[PDB]
Amino acid sequence: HVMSKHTDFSSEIIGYKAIDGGVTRDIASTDTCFANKHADFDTWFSQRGGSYTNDKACPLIAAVITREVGFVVPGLPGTILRTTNGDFLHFLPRVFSAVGNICYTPSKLIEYTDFATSACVLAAECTIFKDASGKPVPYCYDTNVLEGSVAYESLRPDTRYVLMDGSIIQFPNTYLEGSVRVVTTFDSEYCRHGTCERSEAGVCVSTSGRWVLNNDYYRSLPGVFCGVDAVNLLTNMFTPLIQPIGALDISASIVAGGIVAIVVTCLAYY
Amino acid sequence: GGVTRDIASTDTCFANKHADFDTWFSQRGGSYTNDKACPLIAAVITREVG
Amino acid sequence: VLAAECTIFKDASGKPVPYCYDTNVLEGSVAYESLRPDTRYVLMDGSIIQ
Amino acid sequence: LPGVFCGVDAVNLLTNMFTPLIQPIGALDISASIVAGGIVAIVVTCLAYY
C-alpha cells in the first residue's frame, strides 16, 4: 500500500502537529522525514522553506481542527477517521482557542511543550487496563465517550496498574499541582509512559511543573529541592549559602599556615 | 501463631485472601511475595458476617 | 550575521535565488525580512547560515 | 566573558546572576569593587539599624 493525499476538511484546520513515539510534539524546521496524508501540508512546509521525504517509518502528521471529526480509539492521541478510499486520518479536536500539545495526568489536564520534561503521565483520552483476572477493562477521562469506562480520577497513587499490552504505570502521591509542585515518594521505583525510574523515599519541591523524583539526577538539576525528611529540606536548601560551589576546597594549603607558626616560634626564641 | 497482631511495612510475605489488601498494603510502600506458610490476613468489617 | 547588503541563496530545488535588504535595488529579488529564524539556508559555495 | 548572562529559563537566569557572589575571592576581576559595594551597604544597614 502507498499513502495518498486528501484535502477534505481543509477549511476547518488551523495548523499541524507531529506524532512521534505515540506522543504529539511540535514540528521542527530541520526534520527530514514524515508520514503525510494531506496536500496542504506541502504548502505549509514550503512556506517555511522545508523539504522532506515520505516514508512509513517516520512520524505522522496530524492537523488541529476546530470541528469534531472521527471517533476515539483508546491508547491513541487525538481522533482517527477513515476515508472513503480506506486511508486513515488523524486530527486534534479542541474546546477552547488555546490549543497546544495536551497530555493527561491521572487527575487533571496540563499542556506541555516537551514530553521529556513535563508532568505528563498519559496522552490518550481513553486507556485500557488489565484487571486482576487478566481481562481488559476500559478507562476514560470522561465516561460518556465509551460505555463501561471508569473515570481517571478514581485511580490512586502508589498502586501498580498494568495495561492490556503489558506496560506498567506507577505515579507518586502529590499535594500541589500547577506552576509549583510538591511530591512524596516511597522506597520503590515509579514508572510512567515510556520511562521507568528508581527513587528513594522522601519529599521534593520543584519551582516548575517538570517531572521530579527523589534521586541524585533530579537533585543535581537546577530549581529542584529534595530532602530525606520533612524538616531536612530547609537545611538542604540553606546549606549552599555557606557551602562552596564544588570540590575546589583543597586542604593542601595548610602548609602556608604551618609555616607562619614555625617562623614566629623560631623568631621569638631567637 | 494463633495470635492476631498489627502489620508493619517490614514484613515481606503473607497468605493473601482479600483482593483489596493488595492495594491497601501498596500505599504503605511495602512489597510481598505470596506464600501460604506465612501468616494469614484478616479484614475488619462492621457488618456481622460469618 | 550577513556579510553584504545583497546575497544569493539556493532554493529547495537548487536554483540560485537572489536576496537583498531592499527589493527596489534589484528587480526580481526577495527581501531579507522574509527569512524565518531557525531555518537552514545555503549559498553558492555551500556556506550555511542559521 | 564579562557582561554575558545565561540560564536555563527566565527564573534560572535570574538566580545565576548571583553565582559569582558565592565564589572564592580570587576568582574575579580587579573591578570586583561593585560586589563589595553591593555587599557592605546591605550588611551595615541590616546590622546597625535593624
Added chain:
Amino acid sequence: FMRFRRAFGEYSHVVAFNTLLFLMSFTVLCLTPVYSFLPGVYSVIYLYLTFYLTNDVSFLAHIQWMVMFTPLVPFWITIAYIICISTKHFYWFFSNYLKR
C-alpha cells in the same frame, strides 16, 4: 609548663595562643572532607571568639585566619569579616576627616 615559662621570655603568652589556634584550625581542616558544615560555622564562631583576646595575639589570629581559610570560604563571609574588622577605623576616619 614551668620549664616552658623559663624560656621564650615575655613572648610565651603570644606563642601559646598562636600555637593553640593553629592546632584548632588544623583539626578543623582535617575534619573538612566529611563534614562540609564546618568551614562556615567554624569561621563564624572564630570571628565571634576573636573579640575576647589581646590585640597582640589578635593580629596574628587575623593574619592566620586570612591566610588559611580564604581559598575555601564564600566571598560574602570574607567581606562581612573585613567590614566588621574595619568598622572601628572607618568610624574614626569619618569622624576626623568627613563629619560636618
Added chain:
Amino acid sequence: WDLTAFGLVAEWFLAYILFTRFFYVLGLAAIMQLFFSYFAVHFISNSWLMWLIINLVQMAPISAMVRMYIFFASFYYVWKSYVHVVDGCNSSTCMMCYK
C-alpha cells in the same frame, strides 16, 4: 561509582610508607575502636567513668585523623633530611649507616 574505601586504603598505605615510632599508638587506637563495635554491651555496667572512656574511644575519627599524622610526619622527615644532607650526625645508632 563509589571509591571512598579506595581513598581510605590509599591514605593508610601512604601512612604506612611514612613509618614513625608514633604509628603504633594510632594502630592500637584504630583496632580498639574496631573491636569495641562488636562486643560493646557485654562488659559495660556501672562505673560511669568506664562508660565515658568507652564513649570517648568509640567516637574518635581515626579516618579523619590519619591525614593530620601525615602532615605531622612530613615536616619531621623534611627536617631530618635537611639535617642529614647539610650538617651530618655523629651518633652511630641512626639508620643513616647503610647508605
Added chain:
Amino acid sequence: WDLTAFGLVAEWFLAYILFTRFFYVLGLAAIMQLFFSYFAVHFISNSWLM
C-alpha cells in the same frame, strides 16, 4: 593536518633523546591525562589524596 600534528610528534620524539630518570613521570602523566577524559568525572566526594 601536517603542521598542526607533526610538531607535537617531533617534540615527543626529541624528548626521548634527552632521556632522564624522570621521563617515566611524564609518561605516566600522559596516560593519566587521557584516561580521565573518556572516563572518571565520577567516584563522588570524600578522601583527598585521589
